[PDB]
């Protein structure tokens with residue numbers, strides 16, 4: 001609420017980091033290397049961003065990424081398509097969403113219906129090379145499925161602020177070359193923390 | 196031109212990375228650590244972004260960061276203020292800009308007048324804790340002055356895609372904890388490279 005923008009801003013940051021491999025590039029430069037071909041990226045302009053959860057934070061994400069010329073689609077079980085259209089988000093049924101997305105970002109609570117929202121079934125329905133962002137709640141994205149999709153190239157990268165267990169005991173996602181991560185910093189700004 | 200957006204997008208990426216230390220946080224997590232207090236960040240909303248150079252790229256940067264609620268001011272010797280006003284950028288004389296900025300980004304050519312545009316004289320006129328981005332040309336930001344301002348805290352962080360020498364032989368900027376960097380990736384997208 002008072003932390004909505006901190007969240008949304010971190011989420012946008014993560015999307016940009018996935019598109020250009022900025023954290024990897026920095027680690028590469030810090031290791032004394034100059035690796036330009038390794039870190040060829042993609043432009044966000046004209047890409048499709050799927051936003052699952054169209055509450056305050058997903059809303060704020062959307063209007064920010066619209067400025068980059070991203071197409072913003074999404075799904076929310078409660079919010080009407082005409083309301084979401086009012087902030088530039090095209091609602092489609094979930095099965096329509098998976099194949100269209102170059103990027104997917106989750107902004108849901110952690111419920112039985114959202115636990116493993118992204119799982120081996122839904123990664124298969126994605127376009128090959130999808131990039132995923134979870135800055136919401138650990139578990140929304142199934143961590144095993146994600147690892148499997150990063151291994152196969154079905155998922156080309158992921159950005160995680162949150163984990164099923166915090167700190168994460170299983171290190172295979174954090175250690176993957178295409179995964180960027182933070183220690184649950186979504187609300188960690190001076191402003192959010194400081195009313 | 197065809198690479199304007201790739202540049203602008205990397206610049207916005209770097210600004211977000213400075214605000215939230217996503218590269219440093221990723222390296223921290225990769226090293227098995229969970230360091231939440233270390234990576235307290237700042238919100239962009241309500242901050243002032245100074246854009247020095249208001250060509251196509253600086254323009255594109257501006258309209259992106261306006262969506263995050265940044266105030267966008269700038270300076271360009273050639274672009275009219277009425278043109279800059281058309282995309283939400285308030286032109287002030289350079290002496291007016293330095294004290295106002297939370298963030299400063301450079302989008303100029305490398306000329307005698309812009310070599311060391313940011314130098315010890317202009318860092319001293321900055322607000323304490325300014326963050327700086329150079330995704331334009333190596334040398335616009337004086338590298339010695341920058342290091343000095345990082346050492347004192349006058350500059351709270353920098354993001355560099357370019358260096359006076361590439362690859363950089365002097366490693367003190369790249370190695371600084373508050374510096375993020377890439378091997379000149381501003382134009383390295385599939386789209387930019389692929390007309």
Ligand SMILES: Nc1cccc(-c2cnco2)c1
Nearest residue numbers: 052053075076077108109113
């Ligand atoms: N199944 C599914 C998909 C997308 C959003 C959500 C959601 C958000 N608020 C409660 O549930 C649920």
Ligand SMILES: Nc1cccc(-c2cnco2)c1
Nearest residue numbers: 247248270271272303304308
């Ligand atoms: N000194 C200064 C400051 C900001 C922009 C410029 C600039 C842009 N295009 C030619 O020079 C120069």
